Amino acid sequence: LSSSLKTCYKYLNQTSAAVIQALDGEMRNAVCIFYLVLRALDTLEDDMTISVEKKVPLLHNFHSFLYQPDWRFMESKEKDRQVLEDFPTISLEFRNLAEKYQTVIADICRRMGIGMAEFLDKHVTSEQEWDKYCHYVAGLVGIGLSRLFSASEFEDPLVGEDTERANSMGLFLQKTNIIRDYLEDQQGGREFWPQEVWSRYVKKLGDFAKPENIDLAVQCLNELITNALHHIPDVITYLSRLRNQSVFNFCAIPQVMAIATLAACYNNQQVFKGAVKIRKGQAVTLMMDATNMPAVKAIIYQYMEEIYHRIPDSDPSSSKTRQIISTIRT
Numbered sequence: 001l002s003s004s005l006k007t008c009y010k011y012l013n014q015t016s017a018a019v020i021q022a023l024d025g026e027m028r029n030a031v032c033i034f035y036l037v038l039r040a041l042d043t044l045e046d047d048m049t050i051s052v053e054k055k056v057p058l059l060h061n062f063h064s065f066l067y068q069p070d071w072r073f074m075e076s077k078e079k080d081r082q083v084l085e086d087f088p089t090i091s092l093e094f095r096n097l098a099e100k101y102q103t104v105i106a107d108i109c110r111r112m113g114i115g116m117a118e119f120l121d122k123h124v125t126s127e128q129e130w131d132k133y134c135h136y137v138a139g140l141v142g143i144g145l146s147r148l149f150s151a152s153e154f155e156d157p158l159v160g161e162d163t164e165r166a167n168s169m170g171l172f173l174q175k176t177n178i179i180r181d182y183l184e185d186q187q188g189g190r191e192f193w194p195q196e197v198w199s200r201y202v203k204k205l206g207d208f209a210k211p212e213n214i215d216l217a218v219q220c221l222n223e224l225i226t227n228a229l230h231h232i233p234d235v236i237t238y239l240s241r242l243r244n245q246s247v248f249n250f251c252a253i254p255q256v257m258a259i260a261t262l263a264a265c266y267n268n269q270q271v272f273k274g275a276v277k278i279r280k281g282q283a284v285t286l287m288m289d290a291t292n293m294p295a296v297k298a299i300i301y302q303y304m305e306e307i308y309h310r311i312p313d314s315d316p317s318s319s320k321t322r323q324i325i326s327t328i329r330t
């Protein structure tokens with residue numbers, strides 16, 4: 001590997017990785033660079049020290065910067081700011097990619113940037129808006145990855161073309177994350193839980209942090225969880241199609257981790273008191289297990305059974321939670 005490509009894998013290892021590195025053939029570098037490029041865009045987007053005036057063109061034009069050898073950004077106050085400051089090193093390697101991979105990455109960057117710039121302006125209102133936001137920031141990652149798999153010809157064209165299944169992969173992950181991250185987000189001035197949902201419980205999203213609202217908080221939590229569970233049938237469909245082993249593991253691992261994190265957050269008061277995280281050894285076993293459909297399906301079913309037997313009769317979402325788990329299982 002060249003010096004510039006080695007520096008890219010160094011950033012990958014620091015910002016996320018062996019899963020990406022286990023990818024077969026040309027997929028490995030294409031996904032490494034796709035990661036770093038979208039983490040750079042997100043690093044701009046997350047930076048609350050960048051005025052909306054500055055941020056907008058940065059988001060809209062990011063896809064062009066990939067083609068500008070000397071472009072970097074020196075004003076970030078985020079942790080990962082290295083990928084922006086050394087961006088020329090990443091964009092060099094982007095431009096060293098086969099064109100079929102470059103064009104995938106450029107197109108997704110372009111579309112995510114439009115979508116990100118759209119939401120600087122607003123919080124998520126409806127469940128429809130939550131889906132749109134998640135598509136912009138996560139569904140489009142699924143889409144891009146899927147097209148690399150197909151463009152590299154390690155997977156059937158259908159993987160690259162079925163945008164909804166790929167969308168659903170990114171939505172599951174991103175909703176799981178938003179759900180679990182309630183408090184650290186709240187404490188950082190960020191609101192990502194859809195107002196349409198939380199507003200049926202409390203006057204303000206921040207109210208879920210007060211002890212007196214814990215019952216309502218957990219109810220809302222469970223409703224959102226139940227909402228996230230609707231993506232699982234697509235996740236299963238998506239995973240059932242994958243024929244390359246390294247791609248399978250790449251895709252299955254984050255899904256099984258999200259599944260276990262959701263089950264962990266289900267009906268869990270601790271979501272509103274801190275970060276709920278699966279144990280390291282638990283995570284390691286799931287990663288090692290998630291290597292074929294039968295195994296991934298058993299994992300999904302086991303955690304879904306666990307949620308199912310934990311559903312409170314009085315939870316206002318309890319019949320929906322039961323319906324979706326029933327659908328998944330069958």
Ligand SMILES: O=C(O)CO[C@@H](C(=O)O)[C@@H](OCCCCCc1ccc2ccccc2c1)C(=O)NCCCCCc1ccc2ccccc2c1
Nearest residue numbers: 031034035038039042137138141142169170173174250251
């Ligand atoms: O700043 C943070 O630490 C968290 O950011 C969240 C936010 O700002 O909303 C949010 O950022 C949104 C935009 C940046 C996306 C960067 C990314 C992530 C994973 C990748 C994996 C492979 C290739 C490229 C990748 C690019 C975020 O990072 N959420 C964590 C989970 C995102 C799911 C991405 C994803 C989607 C579908 C997938 C399908 C199959 C395999 C992996 C998949 C991975």
Ligand SMILES: [Mg+2]
Nearest residue numbers: 042043045046
């Ligand atoms: Mg982020």
Ligand SMILES: [Mg+2]
Nearest residue numbers: 042045046137
């Ligand atoms: Mg972001």
